[PDB]
Every structure is written in C-alpha cells, then in structure tokens.
C-alpha cells in the first residue's frame, strides 16, 4: 500500500504529533490544496468547522482499494504516512467539489 493509517478513528487537534505537518479544512476548502512532502512524512488534516469532512482516494490511489476516511467532527484530525513518491488526488466524500493533492518526492 502507499499509505499507512496512525489512528484508524479522527482523534482531537489537541493530540496531533509534535512537528506534525498539517492541512487545515475550514470555510468548505482543504486550505492548503496542493502539499509537497517527503516519502515517510505524516500528513495530519485538521478540520476547523462544524461541519464534518474526510479525505478520501479512490481504488488504485493509495492501495487496491479506495481509502475512504472517517468524518471528521469540528476539531478533530487524521492521519496518513506516506510510504511511496508520486502524486495522490484526493476529494471530500460529502462535498466532491472539495479537491487536494499531495506529492511525495
Ligand atoms: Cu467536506
């Protein structure tokens, strides 16, 4: 697979790991859109608003299978590492408008 999952469940922006490298999701937009990262960071989405939005890669993005993650309440983050270089798309499941990338170099 090219990701692995810390914490299968969101856990509270206030538990988000030291030096953790964060993408804030507030006013219906991933706030930084296009993230460039290293293979082997964790990358940490944190949503800022009441209403709930995931992260999700379709099948053949990050594994076989779609990678579809849990909603996130208001102040609750997820993670990914990533494992693999290349480019990953990634959309809101609720809110498909909501569009982001991440390229591992
Ligand atoms: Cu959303």
Known sequence: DKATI???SPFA???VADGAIVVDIA???YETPELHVKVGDTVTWINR???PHNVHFVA???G???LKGPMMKKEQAYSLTFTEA???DYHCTPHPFMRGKVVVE
């Open 27 to 29: 006013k219906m937009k």
């Open 86 to 88: 290349g480019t990953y």
């Open 6 to 8: 810390p914490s299968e």
């Open 64 to 66: 076989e299978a779609a």
């Open 49 to 51: 608003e009441a209403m």
């Open 13 to 15: 922006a206030a538990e």
């Open 60 to 62: 053949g993005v990050l």
